[PDB]
Amino acid sequence: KFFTPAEAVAKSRGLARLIADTGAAASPTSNGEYQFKRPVGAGELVEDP
Amino acid sequence: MEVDIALPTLSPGDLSALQRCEGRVVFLETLRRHATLREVALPCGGDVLAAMAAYRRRFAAVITRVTPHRMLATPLGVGGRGQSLVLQNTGPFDLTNGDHVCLVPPLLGDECLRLTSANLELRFPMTLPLAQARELTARVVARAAETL
């Protein structure tokens, strides 16, 4: 999530969007015995400042 | 059994285009009764050989109705051999009465109902008669054998 600039293509016309979305981001990992990539289809709510 | 595919909220610019896909086939991975649209979806066109190898590992499903919330389907063959349904043709050659049909990945790409709101695209496989699908597979596999 640091080196990818595609969020800039998802241009920002409001700080409130950045706020209200930081608190409802999609969980990108799984619940297995190791940290694995998650199928983006299901979606799980995770907050990350 | 009737597979139920749920839909996210959609812009009217693409919901009306999805309505027109009432007789095409999609490829789930597991036969649960419910499944989200995001699950049943394939990346944009590439490596028709790989895709044709992937259709073997999953069982098909044809869709019948498209409501503003819900989109049904029908698992093609798991226990039935006479469930008469309707599916639309999308291959170049017109298929006549009598003969069987086989699913083949699309050529040249360009068949992608690219949905922007949901940020995904679908590639429905084309339907060809047996006699020509055999020949197409022959050509592609021979060409693969050309490259050592």
Place this chain on the structure above:
Amino acid sequence: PADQPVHNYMIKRLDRRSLNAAFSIAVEALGLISGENLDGTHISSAMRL
């Protein structure tokens, strides 16, 4: 400089979901409730109840 009063309209689109819960019942009860698998005894009704 002075500033005119400002107006602005706006619209929000709905969000739609759904629920589900299965209710499976058995074939023996199906046959005993209606009477397709009934019997003329005193033991049958004891099981239909």
